[PDB]
């Protein structure tokens, strides 16, 4: 089938759903997936008890 | 004459009626030959799914013998005077006519009454014609235009008796009995639904006396017609073994008696027609014809205004190779849009001239005039004179064309038929979006 009418609209719906999840994160739990210790400025003398990547 | 005096000098169609309700209509000339026929308000749209094909079967058996003229005798009589017997059937009309010498009109008229009144419908002949009709169905399968228009009717009028084909499905052909055909004739071959037309060296008083002597037996003074819903829809039969693709696209157009038909026909003349055997090619005033000739986008295209009593198919049929269908759609729909929004006076003038020329040139000979009389009395209850057609064309301008093409084409769902190597036939949503313009 041609991409335009079908998958442009389907990809738009998918993008709106993705935007919903993203804005739920940004506006209702901004810090859900982050770490509180990055609200502390970097201290090369003191190391955090836990050093995890993202 | 100045074509205004020539229209005013065209002979007048004289119409009378028998007590049974058979209408008698004639346009007289000084020609030594005439065409006389019977036109009947009978077609496939009057058939349901069990009887579908009965009218075509009855037309098949029409000349194969009556109780007075058994088998070949009728044919012999026709052939023994130099006359020509012809018949046809549509979804709404049926016709039986003779081209004869003017001195053969009595016999011709007699030969017609018998044919419509006393067909033998003999079972042996019914089986022979069963075989013939099956072979003709397979012959019609070979004609891509006939198939694509049957497809267009089937999807545009799905669920309605206008979707039916004239010939019916082959299963009905195998199943139709003599009782089926006798019932069809007894319910549809009635005097109030028949018109005895004659064009040529025929005096109306003499034809009327003939009709009163040969047709007065017919039904004196009931199931007929339900409207047929139109559907925006598509039917695509892909056969990449076919060398060329056929595409037919139509919106719901007006029925017979709607005045909108005259401007719409004008508009169709603006789009015109084309095939690859044309002299003019790239120089044609029709934009689509010149683009098709310059790019070799198609082998042919035609506009059409098919009318039924209450609806019709207004559209275009084109034939092209697999890799150009899309282009042919784009330039065709664009023309439609260009007419809905920006019709322009000069090409409306050209289309009006084309329409007048089509109407006058079509009515050349006794047979086209006889068909015009019969079909006209069936569709309008009247023969519309060419002076009147000219009055209706003269009152068309670019505003009128813009308005009517907007009313019928713009933002309307079309019905679409595709047959052959049609992978590049655009998806229905893309065509439907091609039925409006965002700039407008
Ligand atoms: C303003 C409102 C839009 C407008 O006036 O469009 C006029 C015009 C289309 O007018 P039209 O008469 O409806 O088109 C008929 C043509 O023959 C075009 O016929 P076609 O068959 O070549 O194309 C039909 C269809 C073909 O579909 C498309 O072109 C696809 C549109 C994008 C789909 C998503 C792509 C991926 C992202 O065209 C369109 O959808 C409209 C033109 C493209 C607009 C693209 C907008 C993308 C926004 C992102 O488009 C433009 O002039 C584009 C520029 C202006 C846009 C706003 C600035
Ligand atoms: C987000 C932008 C809109 C995306 C969803 C709509 C879409 O895909 O197309 C909308 C509009 C209509 O496009 P379409 O139906 O192709 O008709 C064109 C003329 N024949 O096609 C368009 O391109 C509209 C452009 C508006 C600017």
Q: What's the rounded Cα separation, in Å, for the pair B434 and B13?
A: 45
Q: What's the rounded Cα separation, in Å, for the pair B319 and B149?
A: 13
Phi then psi for residue B114, to 5 deg, are -45, -50
CB B113 within 8 A of CB B215: yes
Sheet holding B33-40, edge to edge: B14-17, B23-28, B194-200, B33-40, B94-101, B84-89
A36 CB-near residues (< 8 Å, 6+ apart): none
Q: How far is CA B250 from CA B100, B286, B299, B320, in A?
A: 39, 19, 19, 17
**What is the separation, in whole angstroms, between the first and last Cα of chain B?**
46
Q: What's the rounded Cα separation, in Å, for the pair B234 and B248?
A: 10
Q: List CB contacts (< 8 A) between A1 and chain B.
A: 427
DSSP code at position B310: S
Q: What's the rounded Cα separation, in Å, for the pair B302 and B319?
A: 9
Phi then psi for residue B301, to 5 deg, are -150, 145
Q: What's the rounded Cα separation, in Å, for the pair B328 and B324?
A: 6
Candidates B246, B258, B247; CA nearest to B408 is B258
Experimental technique used to determine this entry: cryo-EM
Q: What's the rounded Cα separation, in Å, for the pair B162 and B159?
A: 8
Q: How many helices (H) and strands (E) does chain A have?
A: 2, 0
The residue to which tokens 């047929």 are assigned:
B228
Q: Which atom of ligand 1 is nearest to the CA of B334?
A: 17
Structure tokens belonging to residue B11: 């002979």
3-state secondary structure B192-209: HHEEEEEEECCCHHHHHH
DSSP letters of B318-354? EEE-GGGHHHHHHHHHHHHHHHHHH--HHHHHHHHHH
DSSP letters of B349-370? HHHHHHHHHHHHHHT-SHHHHH
Sheet holding B312-320, edge to edge: B233-238, B415-420, B245-253, B312-320, B300-307, B274-275
By the 10 Å C-beta count (0-12 exposed, 13-18 middle, 19+ buried), A17 is classed as exposed
Element (DSSP H or E) covering residue B225: none
A-B interface: how many C-beta pairs under 8 angstroms? 10
Q: List CB contacts (< 8 A) between A4 and chain B.
A: 430
The residue to which tokens 């009327």 are assigned:
B208
Is A8 close to ligand 1, i.e. is its CB under 6 Å away? Answer: yes
Structure tokens belonging to residue B388: 């009147």
Neighbours of B247 (CB within 10 A): 27
Element (DSSP H or E) covering residue B423: none
- What is the separation of C-alpha B63 from the centre of its chain, rounded to a whole number of angstroms? 22
Element (DSSP H or E) covering residue B302: strand B300-307
**Residue B260 CA neighbour count, 13 Å, CB half:** 20
Q: What's the rounded Cα separation, in Å, for the pair B35 and B87?
A: 12
Query: How close does chain A come to B262, measured CA to CA in Å?
Result: 36
Instruction: Give B194's strand partners.
Output: B40
CB B328 within 8 A of CB B320: yes
Neighbours of B229 (CB within 10 A): 14
Neighbours of A27 (CB within 10 A): 8
Candidates B420, B133, B149; CA nearest to B299 is B420
* Resolution of the experimental model, in Å, one decimal: 2.1
């Amino acid at each position: 089938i041609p991409f335009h009418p079908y998958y442009t609209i389907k990809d738009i719906l998918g993008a709106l759903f993705m935007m919903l999840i993203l804005l739920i994160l940004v506006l209702f739990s901004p810090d859900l997936l982050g770490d509180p210790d990055n609200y502390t400025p970097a201290n090369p003398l003191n190391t955090p008890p836990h050093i995890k990547p993202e | 004459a100045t074509y205004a005096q020539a229209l005013q000098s065209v002979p007048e169609t004289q119409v009378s009626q028998l007590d049974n309700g058979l209408r008698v209509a004639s346009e007289q000339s000084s020609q030594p030959t005439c065409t006389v026929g019977v036109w009947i308000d009978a077609g496939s749209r009057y058939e349901n799914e069990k009887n579908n094909g009965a009218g075509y079967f009855v037309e098949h058996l029409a000349f194969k013998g009556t109780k007075n003229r058994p088998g070949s005798a009728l044919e012999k009589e026709v052939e023994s005077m130099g006359a020509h017997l012809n018949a046809y059937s549509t979804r709404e009309h049926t016709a039986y006519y003779i081209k004869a010498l003017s001195k053969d009109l009595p016999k011709a008229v007699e030969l017609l009454a018998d044919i419509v009144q006393n067909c033998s419908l003999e079972d042996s002949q019914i089986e022979k014609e069963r075989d013939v009709i099956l072979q003709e169905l397979q012959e019609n399968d070979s004609s891509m235009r006939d198939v694509v228009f049957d497809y267009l009717h089937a999807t545009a009028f799905q669920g309605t008796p206008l979707a039916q084909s004239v010939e019916g499905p082959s299963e009905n052909v195998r199943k139709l009995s003599r009782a089926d055909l006798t019932e069809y004739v007894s319910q549809h071959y009635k005097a109030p639904r028949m018109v005895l037309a004659a064009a040529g060296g025929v005096e109306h008083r003499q034809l009327l006396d003939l009709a009163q002597k040969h047709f007065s037996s017919l039904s004196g003074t009931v199931p007929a017609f339900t409207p047929c819903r139109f559907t925006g829809s598509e039917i695509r039969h892909r056969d990449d073994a076919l060398p060329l693709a056929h595409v037919a696209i139509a919106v719901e157009g007006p029925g017979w008696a709607n005045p909108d038909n005259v401007p719409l026909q004008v508009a169709n003349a603006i789009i015109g027609h084309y095939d690859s055997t044309y002299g003019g090619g790239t120089h044609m005033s029709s934009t689509l014809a010149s683009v098709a000739a310059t790019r070799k986008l198609c082998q042919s295209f035609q506009t059409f205004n098919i009318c039924y009593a209450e609806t019709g198919l207004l559209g275009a049929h084109f034939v092209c190779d697999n890799m150009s269908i899309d282009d042919m759609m784009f330039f065709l729909q664009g023309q439609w849009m260009r007419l809905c929004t920006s019709a322009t006076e000069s090409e409306v003038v050209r289309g009006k001239n084309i329409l007048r020329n089509a109407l006058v040139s079509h009515l050349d000979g006794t047979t086209p005039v006889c068909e015009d009389i019969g079909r006209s009395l069936l569709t309008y209850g009247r023969r519309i004179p060419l002076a009147e057609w000219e009055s209706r064309i003269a009152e068309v301008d670019a505003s009128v064309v813009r308005e009517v093409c907007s009313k019928y084409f713009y933002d309307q769902c079309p019905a679409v038929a595709g047959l052959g190597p049609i992978e590049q036939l655009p998806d229905y949503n893309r065509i439907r979006s091609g039925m409006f313009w965002l700039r407008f």
